[PDB]
Amino acid sequence: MDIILGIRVQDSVILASSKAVTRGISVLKDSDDKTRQLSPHTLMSFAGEAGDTVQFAEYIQANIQLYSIREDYELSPQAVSSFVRQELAKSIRSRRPYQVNVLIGGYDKKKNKPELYQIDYLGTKVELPYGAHGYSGFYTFSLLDHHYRPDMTTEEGLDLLKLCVQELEKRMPMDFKGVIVKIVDKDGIRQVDDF
Amino acid sequence: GSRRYDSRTTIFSPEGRLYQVEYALESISHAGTAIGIMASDGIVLAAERKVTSTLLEQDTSTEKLYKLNDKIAVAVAGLTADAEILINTARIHAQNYLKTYNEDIPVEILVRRLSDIKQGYTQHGGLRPFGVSFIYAGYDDRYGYQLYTSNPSGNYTGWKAISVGANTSAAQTLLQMDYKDDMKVDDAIELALKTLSKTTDSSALTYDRLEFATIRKGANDGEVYQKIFKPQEIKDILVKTGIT
Amino acid sequence: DRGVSTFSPEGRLFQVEYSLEAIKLGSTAIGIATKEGVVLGVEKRATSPLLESDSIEKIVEIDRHIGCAMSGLTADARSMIEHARTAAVTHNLYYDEDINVESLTQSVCDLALRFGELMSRPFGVALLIAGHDADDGYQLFHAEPSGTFYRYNAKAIGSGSEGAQAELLNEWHSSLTLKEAELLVLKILKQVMEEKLDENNAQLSCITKQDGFKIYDNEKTAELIKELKEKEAAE
Amino acid sequence: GYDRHITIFSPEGRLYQVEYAFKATNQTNINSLAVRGKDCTVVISQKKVPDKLLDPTTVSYIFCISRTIGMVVNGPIPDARNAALRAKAEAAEFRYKYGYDMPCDVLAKRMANLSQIYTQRAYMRPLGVILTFVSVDEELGPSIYKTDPAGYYVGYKATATGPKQQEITTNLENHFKKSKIDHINEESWEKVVEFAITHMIDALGTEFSKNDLEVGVATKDKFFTLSAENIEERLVAIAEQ
Amino acid sequence: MTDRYSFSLTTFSPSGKLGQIDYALTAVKQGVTSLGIKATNGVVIATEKKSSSPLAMSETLSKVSLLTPDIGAVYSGMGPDYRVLVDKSRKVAHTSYKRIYGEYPPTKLLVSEVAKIMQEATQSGGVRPFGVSLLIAGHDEFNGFSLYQVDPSGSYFPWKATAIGKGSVAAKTFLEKRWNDELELEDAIHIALLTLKESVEGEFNGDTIELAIIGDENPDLLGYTGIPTDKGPRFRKLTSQEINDRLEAL
Amino acid sequence: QFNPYGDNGGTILGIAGEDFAVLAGDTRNITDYSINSRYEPKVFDCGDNIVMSANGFAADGDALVKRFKNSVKWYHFDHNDKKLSINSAARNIQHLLYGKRFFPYYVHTII
Amino acid sequence: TGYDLSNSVFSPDGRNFQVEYAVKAVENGTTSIGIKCNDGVVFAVEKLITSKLLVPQKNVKIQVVDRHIGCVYSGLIPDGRHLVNRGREEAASFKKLYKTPIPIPAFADRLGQYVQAHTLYNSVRPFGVSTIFGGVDKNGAHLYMLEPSGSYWGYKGAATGKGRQSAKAELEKLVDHHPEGLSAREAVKQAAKIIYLAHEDNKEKDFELEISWCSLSETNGLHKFVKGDLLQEAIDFAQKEIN
Amino acid sequence: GYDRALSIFSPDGHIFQVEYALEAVKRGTCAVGVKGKNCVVLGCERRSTLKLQDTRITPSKVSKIDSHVVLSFSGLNADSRILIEKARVEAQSHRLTLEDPVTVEYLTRYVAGVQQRYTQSGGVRPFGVSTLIAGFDPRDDEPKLYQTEPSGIYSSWSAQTIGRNSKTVREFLEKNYDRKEPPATVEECVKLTVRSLLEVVQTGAKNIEITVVKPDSDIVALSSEEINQYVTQIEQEKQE
Amino acid sequence: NNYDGDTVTFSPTGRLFQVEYALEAIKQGSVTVGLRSNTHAVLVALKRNADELSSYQKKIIKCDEHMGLSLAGLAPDARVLSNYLRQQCNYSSLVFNRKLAVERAGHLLCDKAQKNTQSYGGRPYGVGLLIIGYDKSGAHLLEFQPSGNVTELYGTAIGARSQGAKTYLERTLDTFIKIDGNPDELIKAGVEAISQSLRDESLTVDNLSIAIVGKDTPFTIYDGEAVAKYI
């Protein structure tokens, strides 16, 4: 797991999520997609404890997909983030809590705004222009503090993201085998395939 | 053992009807009439109380109209006590939704869960159904203004205008005569009253035998206000339209 | 009314006896045991021409060495088959071996009387359970809602049963080949079936030690039907 | 009417099972009576031992519920013992929970509440008994509180119960009409027991040997029952008078 | 063994009546007359202490019960059903309110809780409805004085004044004639005493009449001093003596 | 703190021929540095020509052998006196053992 | 009506007809008795010999509860066994908590309350037995008889079953003619006589006698069956007095 | 809990509660399903004896269980909601564990299984509902149509109807549906479906709903006009 | 009549009709006989087929190495009760290392049957059982009936026309009681008894079931060719 980033720009939200899956002294895989589509205009990336991450993600996915069918409607990114937070908030006082951190990047069609939510395993939600989980933040937050502007284009956002990845590839101790990048906007979710 | 005394509330007649549901509907048809009328710019709920006594405290009361949340209300026809049980369930269910999603519950979803509860008492558990029909009047930002009714069967449907309780036959024909799609709130208020005035089993219709409510966009911009008419305001709306 | 588990003054359980009446209304099913295999055949009985007859599934696999045909209120058998399959697979997991046909049948029959005031009524469906095991070879069992099962050399259940059974009583001997038995099931089915037997309103199957349980396609059955007619005009 | 078989309302608003449980109350054909002194509360009941094979000492409808509370039952013995056992349990538990002895009237209220439940809940039948509770309560003084199958209870100056109850009741009413007080103005319980037996004799119109009666007395800090000889001593004093 | 009565004993007839509620209401018809009157500065509730024997001590049987320091209740119908409702009512005032908010519930809401209990006896498995109608009178800071009637069905209504039980039809008319929105509490007590004399057959005095008020706070009745915000119960039961003083100026 | 396990020593050994098999074990039973018994057998005939020994903690060994013997008894009752093949016994014993995966039988088992 | 179709329904008289029907089952059973004596009690019972094929001595009907109590019953035999099993649990629990063996009056109420409880609900049937039981405790000997209603009292002597009246008459004579007490060895003989006398009312089939006793002096306060020489001696005494 | 066996056998061998549940279906508004060569069409009657209806928010008679399967029904509306909810949950659960959406046969079998369970469980009555379940298996182009009924039996149908006057329209379809040649086009199939409903319905007013299911989760409902054009066209071709 | 709706109801003459109706299903059952000497105990059972294509329903069930029974009536009920017995025998072995006494086996069955005759919702067992066994006090035979009544006997029979065998056994008593140390003679005596109950049919090789237990004989069942020796 480890590295998951998100940047919200003018018209979209961009999630970068590292591709490595390490266990012990072996990198078991270098093309892992640490994400799930919750609805046509909602993406969730995740990092944390082995097993818990995918189990939690897929569980949330199924619930949102169930809601969509029942109401023939797509929940707002805010509503989905509130649902996810509550699930994590419940989990933290369970017998065995999910140790999963998520980023929720969605485009609200009613408002025509992109939205980025950062939520940790404790159920701590915050809406942000840019976000990161784990050690990533110790490098990327200050870098974006400097370079980010609120009215950037999807293309400027990807350059800003390159800067983040370059810095992490320079200073982070572990080889995270790069990132998969996805864009969430008025037209839905698509994947940049050459990063 | 006890099999001897079991009415078997949740069984079918040979015709494929549910005895208890049919009989609960008969019960409801003797209750005071309640009307919902939906306009393009708001909704009206009116209800006639069951034959008053001159010595009843009229103002502090609330027998027919109940607030579910800030965007939804109901008019009741049936056993009041049965209806309160269901109302508190609905009020809690609304709050769970707001807690979970940080958004006010869409009107239909609340209507469906209540109707699903009612349905349950007709299929399992061997208890009598709730002797209650509801007119739901609410607003959400997906469908705007909405009217629903539900009954002891656990069935629900949506309306432009509708009545429940006594004389729905007469009431439905009169609404079907005068209702129109472009109608405004104040037109609907008048219709609701003229209807009850003609279907009532009293001699004449007075403020003290009436409950009245509106859901309008009548505050400050793209926002919704619930108004449960105080007795004085009913007294006034009854002169303004010249019924007294 | 009066309890679900009540005895009649003749010493029989009302509800069991009444389920037997529903089984009489069911479509016919026939099984014949040989030393070369056991054959199971059923009357499909589609209630209208528009209903796609191959979707009617009254012959069913339990394991590779055990198969099952049903008659009566056939929706009741879903859970009986489900239990049987689990019993079989479970036995193999605990013992690394195939589970005896009789044991399988006894397990299914244990469900049967688990009803009263456990389920709410007995099953309204009888089963023919047919299979092979190394100890007792080829076997056919009739499993009733009473919890009782009999081994049969041949047996018919359903609306056409008592006619069909008399017929089997005459035609069965201890040297029937599989082909002989297949034809016999086809013959006796056409005898008791309302509409005229063909490859769409009836179905065959067998279980053989070598190839296990097999449901026949409609082409294979159709030739066996044609072969039956040619041999009956031929004397 | 299945509304006659269980505890649900009849069309005229009655509970027939409760009413029939009252008729079971007299099924023993015994009369009881209780009165208050200044210092005490006396309760007497008829004692009929029709079978010669019975051990007369084991034949009793008076119970010592606690150190301070006595209870006499009118009705069949099996229901009577059921009620007594429960009352003993309830009294002991009360002491443990609240650190003081359960008052007569509170126990009576409690048993009345239990009786009420059987009138409302369907699977439980009423007990066909009337329970008369007696003590010298540390707050209220001499006390008589009585329970019936309906779940009703109330305090009494004095009371009677049984098939010939109305006779004894009027007898006692007439005495208090006369004396103009709430109790028997007597120093010793011995003479209050004598009063009770006397007004029973007059009202019922029968004489009693020592084995025709049963007597319980409640004083400050104890309730006890009398032996045949304690009663015989008391019968003698009535005679010479 | 065990409750095998898990099914409703109150069901809908083809006509739509709920038989057991109707029959419970009939039981209330038979019951002794009780009444309530609302004044501008108080509420009065009253009933007859019809005794079962003159050997009984009818002081030990209190028909008028305190529920909270500002709420009281009286009834008509089945006394033992009433008794257990008062126990349950007192407890629910604590469990579902005072233990949560540190203050007693307002009258309408405690009434609402009682109605909930009575509604459930109308629908739950293996029970009959309660055979009582209740008149609950109380005061609370934000609603002032109020008076409610609660029926076997669980339905409740607010009243200026009303009566239930045996002679309710007669008594309700008597009250219509005498009630106005300017009655002072002492006037409502006088009217209550007149209305009750109509229904009472035998003795009519402080020992056969049970009567209580919801009025001013009673500091003498609190039991302690030293907290300025605790001024005492508004519920007061009139003594046997106090009733007779009012019966001479009648 | 109570320790639910002990160690009773001993050792066992099994060899298979073409048309026979042997299962041997010593008859000594110990705790710590003491001898409990010089002759306490721990190899058992279980019927259907199966021999078994569960060596290690004897209370656990005795429980398991006792349980398996009983498994054979009910296999007969349930499947018409059928003989329990050695391969079937082996699987049955796996389930007996693995059923206590989180509070194990402290034994090496040979049949 | 229909008041008699369900257990625990009061009839308008105020009776529980289902209990009264259970009594008819008791009255239909064989005769059993109990006699209280100086320092103990004696139990005996009529065992109808249906056939030659019954193994004699080997269908024992009297049961022991704990070490010091004996129980015998008439009517539905399995119901009586159920009641004794309950009795044994009740006694075991009493001894577990209080150490001392359960006193007879205490034990009597345990059975009483349990039986009475089966007249409270319609989902159980009342017991089809009257049960004579007793023994010796720290206060001496006690004999009890318990009915389907759950009613019980202490007895000088007691009897139930088909020959209950005949047996009752004989017990009354004994009480009248021995006000100062009967001996244990005497009561055994008397018990034998009375079962033989009450067998007249059930005289189609012939029968086997069965006797037991607890005596402070003869059995040391414990319950034992009377067998062999003492049993044969009492059968002889009885055969004597019918002839 | 409440335990009573409500569904039980009669002396003749009938389970009356199951049979009375079927009468409730007979009472329900008609619904029909017809499968073409590349599609399935679900048509449903709606009782027009109710004007002042709001059809924006009134529950539609066809329901999506997943994005590729639909369920219509005849009988008790309230009962159908319970089955629909359960089916939708199982659809998501199947995707979760198998990593594939349900086949139509599997989904039908599940719903049928639920319906059967209510015919031999204590304290519950059977569902007063029969369903038509239609769609296309994942990555498959063969159309599927199944029927379920209160007893729990289910089977596949070339075309089928249920509800009031379903015998009339089954009659129609039986002589108008060539097994040898299903409606080759969407338009053809929608027509035959509407026609069959017109035998029984009334006017083609606010009376007929139609929903069309094509492969790969391609499901769309028709509007008043779109339907009305079919009603108009057939009645002109009628006068002959 | 009005009192036979369930086992929880008494008739006005003190009868339980549901128990009596259960007793009746036994009478419809095929005949089975039990008898014993001081050394062995023997069950003999006439099995019953559905028709000429069916197997003959088994009537004898083994309970332990020293105990077993035969049945007449509802066979599933015999499976339940025999299975209950197998466990009680098994418990006694595992816990106490003690072979369960036949007399205790009877008491346990009595008490199990009785519980189904006093509660709402249940039903009596509809089968009769004959238990044989050899324990620490020699050979035993027991007659179980679903009323709860269990009886120890030298010999008996139950089922249809069992009165024939029952009378014969009564006459034969002094002969067969002393067939000690001779198995084949005790069986033949049993087979002769069961022949008193036959009508229009007689014993064949797939018709007749025999069981024996005794001093040096584990409870063992004989069928088919193993019983040819006795026809």
Side-chain angles (χ1 to χ4, degrees), chain F residues 28-37:
Chain F
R28 167 177 282 180
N29 188 304
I30 69 93
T31 77
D32 299 322
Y33 278 98
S34 273
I35 294 170
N36 304 319
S37 173

Side-chain angles (χ1 to χ4, degrees), chain I:
Chain I
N1 170 55
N2 262 122
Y3 304 89
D4 69 337
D6 36 57
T7 339
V8 91
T9 311
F10 266 121
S11 77
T13 62
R15 315 162 59 178
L16 308 171
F17 278 107
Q18 278 297 305
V19 175
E20 284 180 29
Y21 299 171
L23 253 32
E24 191 62 25
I26 294 173
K27 261 71 82 65
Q28 316 306 339
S30 181
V31 68
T32 177
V33 172
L35 81 167
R36 63 162 202 92
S37 75
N38 299 284
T39 68
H40 301 66
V42 168
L43 297 167
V44 198
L46 171 74
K47 298 177 272 182
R48 181 182 278 170
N49 72 342
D51 64 36
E52 228 53 37
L53 263 9
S54 83
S55 51
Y56 286 73
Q57 182 102 326
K58 358 195 301 274
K59 310 251 291 162
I60 298 170
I61 302 160
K62 182 176 171 191
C63 287
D64 203 355
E65 292 301 310
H66 71 116
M67 199 186 299
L69 75 248
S70 63
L71 65 96
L74 259 177
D77 287 12
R79 187 172 149 65
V80 167
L81 291 163
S82 61
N83 197 265
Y84 174 67
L85 238 175
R86 285 168 168 184
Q87 287 167 338
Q88 294 304 314
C89 286
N90 205 214
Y91 180 88
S92 183
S93 293
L94 297 172
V95 169
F96 293 100
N97 195 197
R98 173 172 194 176
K99 282 159 153 141
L100 176 68
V102 183
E103 205 187 307
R104 274 199 89 232
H107 299 319
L108 296 175
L109 286 180
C110 161
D111 290 342
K112 215 211 195 288
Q114 187 282 157
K115 297 188 185 174
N116 282 234
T117 79
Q118 197 165 194
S119 296
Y120 175 61
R123 73 155 169 87
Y125 293 91
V127 81
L129 313 161
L130 301 174
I131 297 103
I132 54 166
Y134 191 81
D135 63 28
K136 278 209 157 197
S137 67
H140 302 273
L141 163 77
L142 256 52
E143 193 188 319
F144 165 86
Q145 258 170 212
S147 60
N149 296 293
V150 173
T151 314
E152 185 160 19
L153 297 151
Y154 292 111
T156 185
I158 49 158
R161 266 174 279 114
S162 59
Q163 185 56 279
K166 203 165 199 205
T167 308
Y168 164 94
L169 279 158
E170 227 155 347
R171 287 177 32 239
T172 327
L173 183 40
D174 310 290
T175 299
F176 76 73
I177 180 64
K178 288 176 307 179
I179 309 176
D180 300 332
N182 207 157
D184 285 37
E185 281 311 297
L186 228 209
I187 303 186
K188 277 178 165 189
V191 176
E192 212 184 298
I194 210 179
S195 290
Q196 307 316 294
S197 295
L198 305 165
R199 265 245 298 284
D200 293 289
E201 212 193 353
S202 39
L203 310 175
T204 84
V205 99
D206 43 42
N207 192 11
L208 167 71
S209 218
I210 288 155
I212 186 162
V213 63
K215 186 192 166 166
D216 277 292
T217 330
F219 185 96
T220 42
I221 290 166
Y222 298 126
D223 297 307
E225 221 41 56
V227 294
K229 186 214 276 63
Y230 300 97
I231 312 157

Side-chain angles (χ1 to χ4, degrees), chain E:
Chain E
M1 271 194 205
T2 314
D3 220 317
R4 301 309 310 279
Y5 293 79
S6 51
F7 49 84
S8 289
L9 300 177
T10 308
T11 59
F12 288 96
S13 59
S15 48
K17 336 277 260 87
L18 289 165
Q20 290 290 311
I21 288 148
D22 287 0
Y23 305 163
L25 281 164
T26 296
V28 184
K29 273 282 110 181
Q30 302 337 123
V32 165
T33 298
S34 57
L35 54 89
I37 321 192
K38 191 160 139 194
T40 57
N41 66 304
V43 189
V44 55
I45 50 168
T47 189
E48 180 187 340
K49 277 198 280 185
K50 138 93 191 214
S51 168
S52 272
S53 167
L55 283 171
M57 317 186 288
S58 54
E59 330 87 46
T60 65
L61 210 195
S62 172
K63 294 176 74 168
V64 180
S65 306
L66 180 164
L67 299 200
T68 78
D70 303 337
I71 294 159
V74 69
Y75 82 107
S76 295
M78 300 174 66
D81 281 15
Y82 169 71
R83 202 175 54 254
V84 312
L85 278 180
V86 174
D87 291 328
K88 294 179 197 283
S89 294
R90 282 160 183 180
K91 197 188 185 187
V92 72
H94 282 68
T95 62
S96 76
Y97 206 93
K98 201 207 185 194
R99 282 170 197 190
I100 287 158
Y101 302 106
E103 59 196 74
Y104 293 96
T107 317
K108 48 166 175 198
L109 283 202
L110 178 51
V111 166
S112 191
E113 292 295 345
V114 179
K116 188 180 194 264
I117 289 159
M118 295 173 65
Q119 189 280 330
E120 277 160 10
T122 262
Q123 194 174 20
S124 313
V127 296
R128 65 170 172 76
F130 286 93
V132 285
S133 282
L134 298 174
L135 297 184
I136 295 158
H139 172 271
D140 62 83
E141 207 206 327
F142 289 71
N143 293 282
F145 298 97
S146 65
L147 161 65
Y148 291 86
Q149 186 189 316
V150 194
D151 280 351
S153 61
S155 305
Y156 59 102
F157 340 95
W159 288 97
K160 283 151 169 174
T162 191
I164 48 157
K166 224 164 155 57
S168 60
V169 193
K172 279 217 294 292
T173 319
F174 200 110
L175 294 171
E176 281 178 48
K177 278 172 190 197
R178 321 302 223 82
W179 194 89
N180 61 83
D181 62 17
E182 267 158 294
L183 295 159
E184 204 254 289
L185 177 56
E186 275 293 355
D187 303 323
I189 293 161
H190 174 76
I191 294 162
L193 285 156
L194 284 164
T195 319
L196 213 47
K197 196 186 287 179
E198 294 307 289
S199 58
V200 180
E201 191 112 47
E203 298 296 62
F204 193 80
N205 56 57
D207 297 303
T208 59
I209 301 306
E210 213 170 314
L211 196 146
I213 52 146
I214 306 300
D216 286 346
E217 293 157 344
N218 295 273
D220 57 316
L221 275 185
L222 180 69
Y224 63 94
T225 54
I227 289 146
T229 53
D230 297 352
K231 258 154 290 147
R234 287 173 175 274
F235 170 99
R236 194 172 70 119
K237 217 147 182 302
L238 299 206
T239 57
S240 180
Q241 181 57 54
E242 278 165 358
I243 295 157
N244 288 314
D245 304 344
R246 267 165 206 78
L247 287 172
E248 267 147 33
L250 219 274

